[PDB]
Amino acid sequence: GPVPSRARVYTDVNTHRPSEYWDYESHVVEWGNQDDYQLVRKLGRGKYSEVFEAINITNNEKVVVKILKPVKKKKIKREIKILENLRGGPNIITLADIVKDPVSRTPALVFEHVNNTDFKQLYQTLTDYDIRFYMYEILKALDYCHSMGIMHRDVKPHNVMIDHEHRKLRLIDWGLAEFYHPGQEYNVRVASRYFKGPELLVDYQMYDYSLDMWSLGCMLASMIFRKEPFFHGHDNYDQLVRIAKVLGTEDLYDYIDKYNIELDPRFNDILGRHSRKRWERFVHSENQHLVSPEALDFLDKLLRYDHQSRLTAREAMEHPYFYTV
Amino acid sequence: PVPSRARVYTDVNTHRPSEYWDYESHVVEWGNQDDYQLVRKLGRGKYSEVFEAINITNNEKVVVKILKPVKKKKIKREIKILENLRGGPNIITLADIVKDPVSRTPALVFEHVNNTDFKQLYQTLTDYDIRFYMYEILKALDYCHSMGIMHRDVKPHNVMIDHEHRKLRLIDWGLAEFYHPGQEYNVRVASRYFKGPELLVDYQMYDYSLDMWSLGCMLASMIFRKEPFFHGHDNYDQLVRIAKVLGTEDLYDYIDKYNIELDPRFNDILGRHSRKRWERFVHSENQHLVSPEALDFLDKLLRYDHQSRLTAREAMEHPYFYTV
Ligand SMILES: O=C(CCNCc1ccc(-c2ccccc2)c(Cl)c1)NCCC(=O)Nc1cccc(C(=O)O)c1
Numbered sequence A: 001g002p003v004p005s006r007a008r009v010y011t012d013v014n015t016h017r018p019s020e021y022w023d024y025e026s027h028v029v030e031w032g033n034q035d036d037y038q039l040v041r042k043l044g045r046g047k048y049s050e051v052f053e054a055i056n057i058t059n060n061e062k063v064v065v066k067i068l069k070p071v072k073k074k075k076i077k078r079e080i081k082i083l084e085n086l087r088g089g090p091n092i093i094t095l096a097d098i099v100k101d102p103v104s105r106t107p108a109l110v111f112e113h114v115n116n117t118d119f120k121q122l123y124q125t126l127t128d129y130d131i132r133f134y135m136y137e138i139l140k141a142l143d144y145c146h147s148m149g150i151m152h153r154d155v156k157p158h159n160v161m162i163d164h165e166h167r168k169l170r171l172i173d174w175g176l177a178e179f180y181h182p183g184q185e186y187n188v189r190v191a192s193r194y195f196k197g198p199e200l201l202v203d204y205q206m207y208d209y210s211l212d213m214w215s216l217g218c219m220l221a222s223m224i225f226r227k228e229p230f231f232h233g234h235d236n237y238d239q240l241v242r243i244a245k246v247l248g249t250e251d252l253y254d255y256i257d258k259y260n261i262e263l264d265p266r267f268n269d270i271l272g273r274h275s276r277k278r279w280e281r282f283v284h285s286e287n288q289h290l291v292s293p294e295a296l297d298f299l300d301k302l303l304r305y306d307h308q309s310r311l312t313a314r315e316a317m318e319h320p321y322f323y324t325v
Numbered sequence B: 001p002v003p004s005r006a007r008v009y010t011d012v013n014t015h016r017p018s019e020y021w022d023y024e025s026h027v028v029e030w031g032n033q034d035d036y037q038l039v040r041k042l043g044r045g046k047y048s049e050v051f052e053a054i055n056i057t058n059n060e061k062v063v064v065k066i067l068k069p070v071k072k073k074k075i076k077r078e079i080k081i082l083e084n085l086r087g088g089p090n091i092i093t094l095a096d097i098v099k100d101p102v103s104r105t106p107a108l109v110f111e112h113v114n115n116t117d118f119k120q121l122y123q124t125l126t127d128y129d130i131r132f133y134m135y136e137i138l139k140a141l142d143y144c145h146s147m148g149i150m151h152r153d154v155k156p157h158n159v160m161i162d163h164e165h166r167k168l169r170l171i172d173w174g175l176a177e178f179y180h181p182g183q184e185y186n187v188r189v190a191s192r193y194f195k196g197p198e199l200l201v202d203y204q205m206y207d208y209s210l211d212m213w214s215l216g217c218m219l220a221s222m223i224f225r226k227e228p229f230f231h232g233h234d235n236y237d238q239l240v241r242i243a244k245v246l247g248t249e250d251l252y253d254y255i256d257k258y259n260i261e262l263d264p265r266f267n268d269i270l271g272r273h274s275r276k277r278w279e280r281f282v283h284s285e286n287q288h289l290v291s292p293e294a295l296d297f298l299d300k301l302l303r304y305d306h307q308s309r310l311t312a313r314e315a316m317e318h319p320y321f322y323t324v
């Protein structure tokens, strides 16, 4: 079978906490009356949720309301417990209330108000400094949630709220987040395709916080190279081929051999043979103002097949790429 | 009642954006308390417990104040004030804000402070020492007043003295508030013995001058070795203790000036009292701490009329401090 693995940091933080902290299945959820909130407009729609801008009628303050389709009560309890555990953490979306509409009985989460900057406009105006600044803000959120024994498992641009006018950032949608327990085998069907770590694609279940650092690297690559997404897979098998076209196939075999991973036969006629590419290959006239030797060295240290070889969020915060923030 | 406003730093908050003073909208962020290990208890209060602690990541001593979340509004107020005042002369420095993962109880992390043996401090402190530390408190008050904040709980328990390093900090900003001209404040602030007459007569439009009354109470207890100086047994009796020294004539002049309605519960306890000479409180055990300059300075702090008290900046110019 595959060789076991464990996080290099915050390995036993949940082991040493009482069960109430991490046993979300036993967590008792309480909610108030949604009659105190009026929905204003839709902000987003997903598979198991709809997010709205809303107003609390009792204090005239804007909030965000996430209405949850109750596909699994277990999943609702998990997201709520994680949000309650992380509440007030740096750049973590703040859960302000939990409510239920009296007639539909549909539960909803109420968050601090957030104001998303026009993304298409943001993507063209962000400078080299802005990218470093916001990447550092994401790292504060990741180091905090990892220190709190939680993996986000869905780091991607859609799950990062930037209010550029206020230089404010929040890491949002904790619906896929999970508690880290050393040796635990997790479901690999997490994260969104372009942001999936190679551990998920090769079906290595004993992953950890380092999965978030791979997804973060994917976001950094897309921002500095102006290539969205950076690894453009068309399916989950093709996603690994897109990564191998950059990192090369030699190091992919070194990774699967190190953890004694059995590579799915469906990869046999699509993976091919690929040399390790230089990150400088992705520099072009449209992105060269965002690229520097520090950015490429930092990117190289995130985008590694070996999950244990990636920088932790705390190590990443010490990188020279952030010396100006 | 007749409205009143501060003689100094009157509009400092009016002229600053809402983000500075609007604590209810202040977004609090905290780290993981897992990086701190508690060493010993330093004090216990109604809504907090203070510990000496160690940051395990750098092996540096700090102080950790664990807050009982009686009101989130009160927590936001103390945090915003501490963040606004951070680095101010003799103001306790807020170094971090954390939360214990399991209890979810928020805690404030301060620079390390080392309180000198208090029982030893009283008899060892000289006339110079009292002038030196009084001046250190005044630097902190002039700074926080200039920053549009009144402490509202000046008392010995809220002054940290590290005598070996001649270091002072004004601590526990849990009752502090932003000054806005014309605002009516809750009079149920400060500790009984340090309450200004404005609070005792229920005059809500008070200002930074409340801190100068409390400071005067501390000065009187130090130079005369009478702890506390105005020993009230309840909030009504507290005003009678002040009147036994300042006299009832000037108390009526004060309430008439601001058209204050005196609570009927004072009727059969206030009595009639002459204005006393400060020299009356001098004795063999305290005469080495008293001087004409000390009594003149004390007289200028302990006045009924909040507008007639020295400001922290005026107090720093007094001859009592010519040696510091
Ligand atoms: O789609 C979005 C976010 C969209 N962000 C776009 C975006 C994110 C990051 C960057 C960036 C990253 C690194 C460096 C520099 C820049 C950029 Cl350029 C754009 N939001 C709309 C929907 C929404 O706000 N949802 C929401 C809000 C609050 C809570 C929840 C929740 O599920 O808890 C959901």
Ligand SMILES: O=C(CCNCc1ccc(-c2ccccc2)c(Cl)c1)NCCC(=O)Nc1cccc(C(=O)O)c1
Pocket: B042, B043, B050, B063, B065, B092, B110, B113, B115, B118, B121, B122, B125, B129, B130, B133, B134, B155, B156, B157, B158, B159, B160, B161, B171, B172, B173, B218, B219, B222
């Ligand atoms: O009780 C105390 C302080 C106790 N000070 C006693 C004291 C204070 C003033 C003088 C003095 C006044 C005028 C002239 C000369 C001297 C003297 Cl003689 C003694 N501290 C123990 C607990 C503690 O340190 N609390 C603390 C520390 C840091 C921050 C906080 C906080 O709430 O932020 C609280």
